[model samples]
Target chain A: SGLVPRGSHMTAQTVTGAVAAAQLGATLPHEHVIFGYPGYAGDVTLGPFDHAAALASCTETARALLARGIQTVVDATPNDCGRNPAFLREVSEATGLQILCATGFLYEGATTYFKFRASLGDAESEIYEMMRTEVTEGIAGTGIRAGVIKLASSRDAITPYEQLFFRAAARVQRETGVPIITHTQEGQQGPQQAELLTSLGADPARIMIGHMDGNTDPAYHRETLRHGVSIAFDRIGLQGMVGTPTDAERLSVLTTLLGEGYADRLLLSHDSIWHWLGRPPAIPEAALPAVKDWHPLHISDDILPDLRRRGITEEQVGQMTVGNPARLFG
Target chain B: SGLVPRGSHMTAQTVTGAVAAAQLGATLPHEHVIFGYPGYAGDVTLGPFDHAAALASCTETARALLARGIQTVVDATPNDCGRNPAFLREVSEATGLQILCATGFLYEGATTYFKFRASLGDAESEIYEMMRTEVTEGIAGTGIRAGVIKLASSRDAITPYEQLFFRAAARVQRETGVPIITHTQEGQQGPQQAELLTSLGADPARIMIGHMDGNTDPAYHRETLRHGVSIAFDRIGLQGMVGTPTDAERLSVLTTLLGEGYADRLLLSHDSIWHWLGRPPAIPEAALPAVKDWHPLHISDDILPDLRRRGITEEQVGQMTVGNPARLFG
Candidate 1:
């Protein structure tokens, strides 16, 4: 009850400010406007970030989502993962797309700075203070509050180092009442993540396990969902990637879960990137089909149509895309 | 020789752009406008940095330096150590003081990011490119170029990890022709630093081995100077701290060196912090005397007077404070 946000009437703190849960329509709860690997900035000569170009590209992505009837999207990028709240605000203002950025750190990706800081001792308090400050105040003096707590673990385990973020996230989430979204690397740690957060007194109803699409088994999804925590097939349209399922395979698992009465516990998104900070990858010709439908519009343009043809109704699709995110944030 | 700067004439790059070496009247070759430990920003709640207050304080410091006849200051803060080029530019513009910002990383303090990035391979090229970009283009799209390269080593020896920065600093120096300033932690590795940088083809005339004042023995100074590199008695007012000599000890050794014809190979500054990033340190009553004169004005107000009383000539003082800096940058 303490973790339940505002006693069931919740609001998502966004880049521009707070917005009621009802105002979020056809939302994509997990995506990034821009994401870069740590140390990309150190290779500036390889390709320096063009601010104007990044803004234009993100604006273009926001406008495309608006055209497809999406009203809100949660940027799951954490602080160390190029979570630029000002850039998010710029994109949201430019396209009127409600954007929620995250306040947390990645496990294997961008943990060096935080990890080094942890070596100075009292890492837990420092981490909690940082996330809480971003959620309650603003991020790094930008006056832009974060709406979600994003955490991640290593491939098959919650590293001792990463467990610090989970402990801190649970505490910050309890205090701030923001929803917690997480990365399940290759979908290995969904159940582990849920157990850790929930055992630490996080509200399961407000947690969404991300990249569940990275695993295609119905058993894995059901195991994660058994914790009363929602699951996200957030990495949709990612095919031919090692340790990732095809879009078709993801659909089969989704239809199975829907038939089993898990629609209210599912969230959908492309986890597509709007822009790359370093050089954009040139997908090989052989791997073209793998990412052909990898953009944000895949869910709106392709997945929904195929689901409708497969005998899933509009409400089921809406429950996965719209209602689930609303409840998770609310 | 290739190590000679600009064939006898050189230009010191300031935050506002190029400034003639002659324009740098009495220069503080190694100092910080503002600095913090690597993780200070994470503890923002303890003391969130007030932009207005920081600007006003640094402006006050700039005016004080001008009153003391100090014309230029090299901000020796490296990238990972709160190297704020735009802040330097603002202070310079506000007070008409020439400020030079640095582009490098520290050895022990802020090596996590770069070291973690090194684990991903090709650390050498990445470090080189980052420093080169900041020197040639600008810092992180701020359009403010760094005027110097700042590097540091651990006490007693150069850690293998820190060697990456030295190699990069050498290449950057050869290409960009910027002076390389170094930190000899605990005053133990001044000779080692001079040897390595010079061996890497860095110009000895353009290399300053800093914190020589930490070691009071003239033998250490003579050994470091044997590499034909300039030595900085930069931490002039850091008395009563561990591994640091008292002001009295520093004056004795400095007077010995000045009398022995080493004045041309010497530089001077307080190495005093302008303003702290987090909470201003609350010194215990007993330790109060240690930092009583630990500010930018200490050299002009205290050290110079003491040197004049000890029979060091005005021309000798001018050569260390002015002529040596001009030659090092030139």
Candidate 2:
């Protein structure tokens, strides 16, 4: 099993994401460690992100989680995704929480043609090498290895090129046995694409269909759960997006799905990346809002408690917050 | 002056339109004395709406407005558009506020070929007959003639068909000396169409550009105002539409434009019709939220206070709410 065994870097912890995930003795199933500065590729202006300041911020955050009995945080920050692995290893060693790393390309909008072109052709072989290298030699020989397979999709239908990427991702999952987590579009296509991955020989049980709450349609979600896949209701705070379900809506979906006997097939995460330092300079007008406040998960304080009032029992919360991820990373 | 002898009617005191508008303010600039319901064209079995309850509700609403100092309500409701004119007169006699009626075809979405066939002709004489009849014998010979010309464009562009209708409306405005009020599309084309009206010999000063707030951009609004058009910030409460400015945004736009010295060029109304009596049938495929409440103008409480806060003086408010409209419908 491609689980456990890693140091970690924690992403910038927003005031909200830290409080909510650390509540109820929970495990943060998904969170970021170090974030990238904007214009990571072209301008190469490193983020104003101070590692010491971030660590100091996380000290209180980690302690709060410790107070709530949270023992692990799967720092799923992928290399070439944000900051490098050495920084992540330092954070994990300092914090003493079992931290996991991820290996894959960043999101669609974040990548340049060069990055996209590099990831083409034998993505499985490339992903295998990257994951093996991260886990064995520590990413880029920094001695902090990745523990999970991370990937993302676009808003519209997956492009033909991405279909090839998905096929390669399926191949890597088969070989490495590292449970896969995916970033999906905000609606019905997420489950549909999960089915696409399962059809491509990836284990449906091992994949976390991320961003399930992006669609408010309950029927679409029920169909997703019926596919025997774990769902991540990420983006816990940003309410401005179309169909981004509120906390009440999330609780309703979760409770309804749990009532339908799908508790084991659920996971929760903030998916909060504090900054996007590596964004391209010539990014189009349509991508401007994306580069601002990329970390929606950090704004989840009000919503997390709202979920509790909506009848999300502590034990059920534990299953999603801790038990499921612990099993995946065990 | 082209303002005087524009004519008037006995505004329906208790029509749903009146009630909705009166609740909005004492001086209802754009409203209906009566609304017609012939049922959807495909399903005649649906029957006409219950006008009695609607009228009573309107009366109650009128009494409330009268108590609050509302002396006039421009009933832009048209006859031969749907329901009979005699019914409109009866309701007008019931309510004491001076009612200004409209003469024009409802949009293609609302009426049939026979009711508005002339609207497609751009024929000056026939357009004059319709306008003169509403001004002379009154619509449907009920002795309650229209005081204004009402026209509408679809949601997208000003179609060639709509161009003819607008031309007919301009001809009516010239012949009858009645001010023109038009339903503008919620798009960039609204200001363009307003420009077209002014170019077609319609007195831009006498034309009301309805639903301008639906366009939202400050530049777009300023452009319409530059043509000396009276802009109607309709749908004041519905913030769900893309680019649908909030009440605060509307006030800010109004105040800023006024500060730039355009006070007499604005009109404010909810454009809300009572949903119970004569409403569109609930469509299964409609993606937007349905109107659940009876009155859309209840949100005016929030909007009026916001306007005052945004620095719109009482005099400026009166101009948009009363003086400009009084002049438009003399």
Candidate 3:
């Protein structure tokens, strides 16, 4: 199946990421220890970074994850994606959850200013070296090796800049044997995207096509999964903008993919975060719709219960959510 | 017009309410100082009823309201709706925003065990006494008097218990010279409700029938507005449940009503609150597919501009949103 090895980026900076990593646990495949918006440093005092809180949150989440039988969480926060070695190590040590780091730049939204700042080739080289260094020598002398290569494209189209970056990412993946997790533009421009990435000589088997659930067309998902690619049904509980996939829809996709013999090519995540900085100042606490209290996945009630009601065997659930991610990320 | 003197309530516990009271100035015919679930004390730690926080929030909001030209905020937090006179006084003293409290129970969802524990007549008597005390002696010994009565019914049909409560509220209104504001059950049963209340000797001119926009049918709104009753287009920005009125729709309604000489009878508000306790938690923010932030009559970016485009004058806008609510609530 094309949608195999579904993966998602994770971060400990946001409450949801910390909670998901520590509580969700075991074979995250694509998670982050620390992730933040570009230019977040300027806004740090306005509720941007809270390392101590993240650590405390991580401990509680990790304990919950252990009880739920989770063991690994792949930290997919890249260099340009607000990657921090100190924060990653602290989270790993505090939670005792297996952490895998990434190396690359985020999408246009995060890298917009840098898009035309430098030439494409120069940008690529810069990314390649950073990723290669992290994978080989670890980040900032932390001794934690990069386990995955990450990349992203714009929502509109693959610009020349992104193409250059993807080429660099491909080169790194080929050399480091690290898997690739991509951030798609919420599943728009699908076919063009696949063609563009495959043309970069990136091995499809090592690729996890992100945000596949953003598009509702099953054929789009099936086609992506058919290309020896993993599809991530991220944004599990986020139904406001892009309609969220119900557990049945997820199970149906998984069951169909599995029936088509592609169980090895899928991943699941909520794609939720702890805060949204863009909301009005008046609604500081009530601003972000994805806050920990909002229950993005409604995981405690809707998703898990639906899965149970659908008679999804514990073994199958374990395989798709846990075992498969471990094998792919490992 | 009949709708001019009819009143409504407002809850001042959120930033939205603060913004509403502030910007809509001089006349917040329908507003509340605070509103919480009746069983809130049990879940006080869940961060719902932090009176200090509520007081602080209200004080700030009241300042904003006064700055934005608002002189009064009708604190519509009903008895079963978590009316706290001490909290109300703190807000009134701190912000100097005139607070008009209410003395009835809310709809089914906001009702408490005590609401259900008593018989209908007993409940009515209890509500009447509460309203009388607030009007005669002031709330919590702060000398802040309540000038209006508030009531609500569920969408599942006005429960017999609510009818009893409404009749009692009418009795209180007749005795006290306080006006009545009501939460109509999704705008259904409005005419029937008008008849019921009027039959109980409550003046229709003193009532603001809320959630009329939830009905969407212009004829329904017209019918309700024709019966010597004020129609509250509350939940102006909330269309996700019952489809929101378009700018054209809103303009058409406003124009028709105003041109028909009923301009003074209309009241507008966005019953947009960030409800943090529901299953999914946060509802949609005030903007997008509904009205944007701040102004309640703003039916998206284009509506006001469109009205201006259509040569609707500022005075007319003021007549519908500002002048009308002030006349009614004042």
Candidate 4:
């Protein structure tokens, strides 16, 4: 009756190939190695590249996570910004860390291509073919298939354009049965994305409404999770960029949600792009006014330790870090 | 007289910063790490990255020349593809070799931006600011100043869009006194680029009219050189891409030019890109049929030995490979 068969093995598509969901051990569901901002329509074309610096920044960050046994990283770099399959594949091979990449669109940086596509055909029709093709055939010319269908809606409301992407992504989700990871600006549209995606005939449980930590309102968190889709407090160390909850603030919401018996539907990550493509500092300069401890290692080094000190059980930690994600992918 | 002081010394920009022209030994005046093509606009942004594969490709190729004492390579990756200053700086640091980078636009794949910029204001005004800022400030905020003002003219005749870039490049060249490297599509417009650029007040002696190997006509080569610009027989191992003259055919013209005392205005390179941001092979697949031996070492390893066998002297080889590049950048 569902995509993950009972008593059957489950594999998630990685940069190299499919790996057992159980073997995905300690995955960061939403992060970026390169978040190339799509400035204007002209930003869509080719340009200069420095492979060495990209490798140095990307690899150094990937290796740090690897050193801590953070086995897999899901690169939620949306298609329009900088979703490079070849580069992802290289980082994975160099560090022996499994990399899962996205194939979909973002809310803002992607409007150029999405609009052009929308004009050419029914926007959903255009996007559905692209998403389905990306899921089925793989991105560009690389053999690495996307493990997740990533989507996003900007702050305030879901625009008409974002609605098209949502519909297409839902159908692609149903057709491919791949997990969906999404960016919800300011955590505003989590419930909206959930409602639209599920109303359009998607399994509510199959999607992860990402960036739930952007807001610390427990009621907002609980209302969005009412649809039975998973919630990701993904931007764990991302307070510096967006001025949201700190790790302690995020942990407060997460631990409360767990205490309320919603532990099974929870996921955790930094939403941190430890190595950015364009410049150094890993975090953008404009984003570092109050920044520190923004990497996958944050969960283990600080979050977990803090959680234990707060009297959370080992089983609780395992559920959020390990079991919950495995169940999500499975 | 600005930055290039006559009979004293001069410096060229690398991925790091200015380097004494004398230290830029056995340099390849033209090459690339990434060239942005427009097959898929989404390929331009960041997502999956294969840093190990990129490192293996870039370093394996960089060291091939480095091990044989080729100290510097000018990466002429334009602004559209993946003109990443951070990546160039990293490659230079890792390989212990000098990597010069470019700031400019190309012809076909780059029309979208060029045409749009030409419309917004004075196109050269836009271009001149970008080039001057890149030379003075840095590209993409990586603190990596470009070494050369790279410009190109497409095939048959120059379009109005390309002319905007040419005028802007000539002006920037004059203001900064940084050397100019150019792209000649099918060897057409080589003389036109030189004549127009020189007439626009760019010093004729400071421009390297690149890709001269795209044709086998000695008369055509001589005519372009008559503008007092150095000529780059740069695509020595790139016969697999274009159906242009073979290296032997290029060499026949090259050796003739040298014998006729044009050795003072010649350079050599594979014009190969070790790491491509868009897809593999750097050169588009449609353009590639029998690609091989197109790396940094091919000149030192294959072409020079072959040049000796063809009765080209050590002094002529040194002049083209060493002395001429030194002079051009100097």
Candidate 5:
């Protein structure tokens, strides 16, 4: 019992199966193996499905992360956003990088069908039951359980429409003891997300506000941390796309927050998609420079070394990259 | 022009035609005669086209505003969001209230077709041309020109996607000498929006940041005003629906901003929708009390009276409800 591995005493649900949380070493807590915007499938040519090709490409992507010593990745693709569970399991099995998948809807991808259902009332209860079953019985009978609940709100504040999902996700998180992650478009409502989830009796420690990197305001970061919830600079290396700051700017905000003693409540990732489920979103040729480093290995190859240069110790880095993820997922 | 009405020197384009801006007395700068979310058209059961019923209902709504001493209303319904120009024209003629219609897309209603175009590039040019043609020619061959360009961005920082519209709208505003009104989701990005449009060579005087009422922070209002753009307390009576503050809280923020001597740059409107193009959005029965005062007449009946009780003078009230709208739209 003396000085056991960081997560030896706990377990986490992975794409493969339940595993000792220590197996999730150096976790890249928010990455996607594959994703598509809802209705990308409606495009007959671009959104065509090819699973074997997807599995091969995603395996190569995961192995690249493995080469960089990233042992785990939380695939944050929501169900409506081309979340392919079998594909994720294939990549995880092939590369040996533990993968956790999400069960929820992206805000934009909350699409017309659910919106129509929400109009009839009782949609929240239905949503709660769906998430409950996904976490326990598995998604659509694939036998692959979701490890975390993903919720998203539009920019500034959560609309009443998005409230249905947030309330349902909170209920499921309460019932199942599953951790919750959230998408705050362009770095907004992190504090609101934290407050609302905790107010609904979800544990503050089990929530991570994704894309804190979208907003560079240090005061905002501190305000979010004051809620005793975790934050993710998950959009690292995506400068000028989706209004994200430069990696240098994100690193500065990160180091400042680190100095303010929030490393214990921070998680790290790229929010990158390795295999897009459609023709990739067009990056105008001129805008390529902005996303050159936007990938799963960005933090390991760039940000962490830069962090060390800024006097962040290895233990502190491990707390964010490894310990915090294990603690949240376990 | 010699000591006549505040807007005597300029002309504004209303649904009927160009009129002396002074004719637009006590204007509500942002309201809707008829609107529906993009796919509300697909729901045949609810989104049935009953033009006669729509005209009758909207005329009554317009007459109610006329009875409240509102001589003008800007119908800010974007084209993709059920903007019915013929209905607006009929309502204006029946109620004798000047109506201004908008020419652009709501951020959420930017829809699949345009988004597909955006992905293919040259979208900004296409959008710029569309707004230009709408202002100069008319919408969909109605021969009823748009009086203002409406552009919207989601909360926090403006996304690159929304930036396409912002850039295009600014181009049209610069070219046509038309004013621009913007939707800053839940009161976010007013300053950023103001800065961006102005940077694009659009006149600061011609930009009105709609829905500033969603945020109660006086500092935010001050920052928005500092850019020399008008700000609308446009979502007057909506309290809890979209994370809007209560009318009481809004009045307090309004009083604070007015006291800071920015009356000349302030506007007032309820942003109320008169007729739904589909079944109305389901507001839970219990939430009815919060939106009881959400009609277009609320500002004239309630907000103005409350401002008076709070020691704001009639002229200041007039500046916001009358002079500011005339100045921005003329």
Candidate 6:
């Protein structure tokens, strides 16, 4: 039961346009193409950029996803993070991969402009208008409307400034019936985000609380799911960041959750980008090779096999990789 | 004489590889290929982005520049602002245009990363090494090295944070001999940038004070030139941004400078891009068409014809467009 059963089939928004969700094979629910975030300068430049290389790079990576039987990539590159929906479009057109893009804010710090706007009088309504505008009209002045609403929460706690974002995204989601994905920084406030969104008129079934794997406390993962919301164990292969827990630790948590019968409540992603924006982020240069495979294929190549060995059924893997994402976006 | 000799032309780096400075023809010295500043995002992605449409649009724009005998584009898109050196390589490969990219920061608030970065102890050396590494090795982990250094200043003041960028960029320039192009916000503080860069032991001959057209003061443009630095009337076609002088006003300043014999110390560019980072930036969206001609061929199609009408000689035009840029990078 997708949103619109046009003679009985599922559909999702690719960069080019909407496509049948039934065609979205082994979808990677959360990923990025060329996110620049802190890597590129913050101001928009209407300058000359080489399109061919980015197209080529994204083409190769996304096409590899195609070669491996993966059919869709929901590019969650936030707006401020060099999220070129146009590049995603070209990648989609060339690679025959279905791509869905998010329309919303990162965390409070990531989107300072939203904070300022939220500080204004009638902030929620204004922020609501902005988010609503994108879901209806388009982002900025482009025709590439987003398929999903993306919202983020603070790790330590949710400030009032950030609270406005949830309120805004919640309002927009209510209007568009668009699926909403959220960031739980360090996976600290998953339940808090789940509670707030649900309390603010958001359907818990329509949301995915992201980055739950950031915390190994299986309690935290279960905490989000308890709210009738899905849990995204999104950060799959990243092992180099300073505060990141071990990959096996994340896997163990995933297995525990599955064994506990929360398979339909799960989604998988690396939240990794293929092309570096400008400076390739502030990651430890020496440690790059260690996570070289932290890509869309990591789950399909490694995790699925590992899950199978650990008694995760093929249906469970399919539900997390393909069925769950399709149901979420459909 | 240029930095290099008539006997042997030195090469500058591009996204593709390296090209001889002498081979760079009718160069648009201060241009951008791709950029998404922190300012616009400060962060969401709701839009209609067509990658095929943008690639086709940029291909047409760049190819038009080539049709007019323009053969090189120096992309000054900062690393944090969607500066994809690889994209520049593809543009070069497709259009047969030499593309040079910048390795540096914007200004006080535009680059939030550097604002925090400059606050650190030993920031100078760390920043220097970052830029120096790009000059010697390459940007991030890519083999595509930057051809020039880009640094920006505030509207009327160089903040303590910005001063650190200057010092770091200066040290890198001293070692590499890579030319510099700077942002003189609203055309304020050209003289201060010249003095600071000069005192830091950078050759003023290799510096181009950019965005000076934001002001119409002949004295300001002349003052920057007397420091042995070239001046760029870089914002050639953009009229959408509020608080800027007209095209006629910029033309008058250029013609006056040419009449006063500073032809060898001038540069021209749209400072425009092929692909917008996400949406078009946060300028008044209603006024997009006013600056629609802010592409690569605006100079060749619009400005050059106007410059000739104002009685500027062809040789003088060639000196600013071709000769001065060659001297700076050579």
Top-scoring candidate (lDDT): 1
Candidates in order, TM-scores: namely 0.73, 0.43, 0.44, 0.54, 0.54, 0.58
What DockQ results do all the predictions give, each relative to the true complex? 0.10, 0.01, 0.01, 0.04, 0.04, 0.09
Q: For every candidate structure, what is the RMSD over all alpha carbons to the true structure, in angstroms?
A: 6.0, 25.1, 15.9, 13.2, 13.0, 9.9
Cα lDDT of model 1 by residue, B1-330, tens digit = 323464322267899888887898999998899876554444454456778989999999999899999999999986655667888899999999999988887665443556655654667777788788888888878778888888899896898888999999999888767888988888798888999998998888889999999898899999999998989988887787656889899889999998998888989888878877754554555666777777888889888889999999999999899888887875
The DockQ-derived docking category for candidate 5 is incorrect
lDDT of 4 by residue, B1-330 (tens): 212323322367778778776887888888887544432356332223476777677767777778898898888877754566677677788888888888886674343544534443455776777777787777755677877878877788887878887888877777777788898998889999899998998877778888889988889989998888888988888773535667768878877887798877888888776765532332344544445667667888888998898888999888777787776775
lDDT of each: 0.81, 0.56, 0.56, 0.74, 0.78, 0.74
Chain B TM-score against the true chain B, each candidate: 0.96, 0.78, 0.76, 0.91, 0.94, 0.91
lDDT of 5: 0.78
In candidate 6 chain B, where is summed lDDT lowest over 10 consecutive residues?
Answer: B1-10
Q: Relative to the unseen true structure, what is the C-alpha lDDT of residue B297 in candidate 2, on a scale of 0 to 100?
A: 49
Query: Docking quality tier of candidate 4?
Result: incorrect
Ordering by DockQ: 1, 6, 4, 5, 3, 2
- Please tell me which predicted candidate would have the highest DockQ against the true structure: 1
lDDT of 1 by residue, A123-146 (tens): 777788888888888887888888
| lDDT per residue (tens digit) for residues A1-330 in model 2 | 222312321221221122222322455667775554212221111113455766766555655555555666666654434545555555556665545666665544443322322332343444455544544344544455556667667777776655655776676566555567777766557767787888888777567777787777778877877676778776665444334556557667777876776667777666665333332123344544543333433323444556567676667766776667655554
lDDT of model 3, residue A160: 75
Give the Cα error of residue A64 in candidate 3, in Å. 1.8
lDDT of 6 by residue, A188-289 (tens): 999999999988988776788888888999987777787888888887887645456767899999989999999888998888787866433444456575
